């Protein structure tokens, strides 16, 4: 779904990836990241957010919770890293990086609450009073006051599998009263997910009922004198959606895919953020008239559709399509329409979440200058490969 | 699907896991491995195979391509490691371990063929003449002769997504002639997958058409004087299936799940190999009457059905069931029937392939002696966590 955008916005990345593969420097099932471009994208996001006075936390899950990229991006002026789960937080803390937000989308396990509080986490999102009590106890024991966000929801919200969580709007005042009575805590604000979603029919990113629930919650609380310093509204945060967030009084947002240009608003390759990643594989074998490339990077919600096949003998690039993929079996290989020579290179570009796949992540700098150089190699879980 | 077997064969593992979690030593989304038991299972497999004269290669993908376990198991007398793909081979070679078989289920990428040949790989499976030519060239350049296996298939075989590969039976003689003419190669034999499959209706592991195709291929080749030193017949290799393999003249087999007792023949917990793994999680939150545990370990083909919930205040264990899981969205959490306290521990036991998930792998020794001790912590891709 991003091959069109890749061809338009970053053909140099295609050339660099293929060149490095031909040199034997990039193995199949690797996402190749244009470091020059991701940093440019990150800067544009910061400059845009600054005008609106919106603070940004960096989301890294989609590019494989990569600590090298996280460190370089943080240096652009981001307020900290938002860790989707405790394993992502683990990568960041091991790297010596600040974690600004933990608890969303995934809560902090009981035996890790004290570490999150003691090591320093700007805000912690809680989904239950029992978890809030755990955070309060840890804060008191550490002689600190921990800021928290509350995840809210209402019955008309978009509630996705794995994200069914939070305090119902009908009980929010009772919850807030409890939170304000816990000694270890400071109620900093609210969050929800997803707050914005791409609408294909309209052709725009639009607010979701979830965002309206967040606003309604803020407004209800304001009637009882509750002032909230943080309204955190993630999902599809990008340069062109930031003004929309600003209109709703959002104070904090969390770019993830925007950093690599891989947002649904960019399918025509016309957004300020340019495509900064592609997936490289190679032809393994043929079977009954079709070619199969090494798998490992397949993502069910990715809308992978188009593939480029590079044959180094003649340096030819041919477009073909992915055939239907069985989501029930492990993706050892992926089917491509048509026969291509064994050991030809393959390029795809689609929406992924690297952290739930087993792809390598290869960091390439200097593409803007025409001097591509590999500056890092990592796995999908954030480990260096050396 | 293995909770019954776990309760019968290894209740000590349940007790050890919960005890260590209560001590704050095992985080949610960890497979806890009984080292004493996996090594006992590995020994039983070796002793059984030896009587039949079948050689065993160790398959490690399902327990997270773990190099610590691989090394300890190899020491029991295994002929080497079979690496499912080139990333698994990467873990093993970095650990300084011998790789006996590469190429099945996944081929060797072109820029890695020379390393596989030069570093030493007992047999390499090829799916195409072009890959065979690559191996031959590499062998000649390295002044070696490389043994190869051919993957065969026929149209009535069980051919699963990701495993659609090999030479058709109708062209095998032509292929073998070509292979025998390539200077770098020695034709060692044949392989296929799956060669055995559990049959739930019958209640036995049975040969598949794939195994019959392998035998037919061997017999056809024998008519033209081709002698094959290796008939490699993987899938459901275990203590009770080894005599069946022996009856077909299989020379090499490849236990994976048998090492941990997590084979479909063991649902009643009556096989020689005892359950040696469980998955530990924890209650994150509640939503609309149900509890949600941390995810990360879900496997679509795993038949996860039953969960044990441990509440440390009273030390009570309660069985509940997993609710229906949406396989399309990321498993940040998993739904459990009923409400349980936040931060209660959760135990599951089901068929997994750790390498395609993001679970930790925690190695616990001394369970047989009643002195459980953590001797290693790894991620799902084989990296040490420290
Ligand atoms: Cl070519
Ligand atoms: Cl309890």
UniProtKB/Swiss-Prot annotation, chains A, B:
Pfam families per record: Ala_racemase_N, YhfX-like_C
Stored InterPro entries: Ala_racemase_N, PLP-binding_barrel, YhfX-like_C
Protein's UniProt name: Uncharacterized protein YhfX
